[PDB]
Curated annotation (Swiss-Prot):
Name recorded for this polypeptide: Lysozyme C
Organism: Gallus gallus
Compartments (UniProt record): Secreted
Active-site residues annotated for this sequence: 35, 52
Other facts noted in the record for this chain: Lysozyme C is capable of both hydrolysis and transglycosylation; it also shows a slight esterase activity. It acts rapidly on both peptide-substituted and unsubstituted peptidoglycan, and slowly on chitin oligosaccharides.
Length: 129
């Protein structure tokens, strides 16, 4: 499923990401844009052989099991495929574990390089929320 920008924002808010750990809703929408283009079926390979899955490109190195990432953990205790559903529950709950881990949203390299320090509020401009 490919989300509309305001559609994604609404689901993220309902799922409680709005100022979760102090990160305003715009941050999460910005991250999702550049990680996955709001496409829940997005998958990308990393240099270490792990894979990123879902609207928020959660990686198999630490957070989900895909059975093909040697020397990896599954800290959110989910199959990585579960993250590609049109329902973003599993991704959001996992992201909540991740962002509470210590580096906050810097865990998402795209957020760090492309959203951090920008006006992320622009990403929920005009949305009914
Ligand atoms: Cl957009
Ligand atoms: Cl709807
Ligand atoms: Cl584990
Ligand atoms: Cl990570
Ligand atoms: Cl980047």
């Amino acid at each position: 499923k490919v989300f509309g920008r305001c559609e994604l924002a609404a689901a993220m808010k309902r799922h409680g990401l709005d100022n979760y750990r102090g990160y305003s809703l715009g941050n999460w929408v910005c991250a999702a844009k550049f990680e996955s283009n709001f496409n829940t079926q997005a998958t990308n390979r990393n240099t270490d052989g792990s894979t990123d899955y879902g609207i928020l490109q959660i990686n198999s190195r630490w957070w989900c099991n895909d059975g093909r990432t040697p020397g990896s953990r599954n800290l959110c205790n989910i199959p990585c495929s579960a993250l590609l559903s049109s329902d973003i529950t599993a991704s959001v709950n996992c992201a909540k574990k991740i962002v509470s881990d210590g580096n906050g949203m810097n865990a998402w390299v795209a957020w760090r390089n492309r959203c951090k320090g920008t006006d992320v509020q622009a990403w929920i401009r005009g949305c009914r929320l």
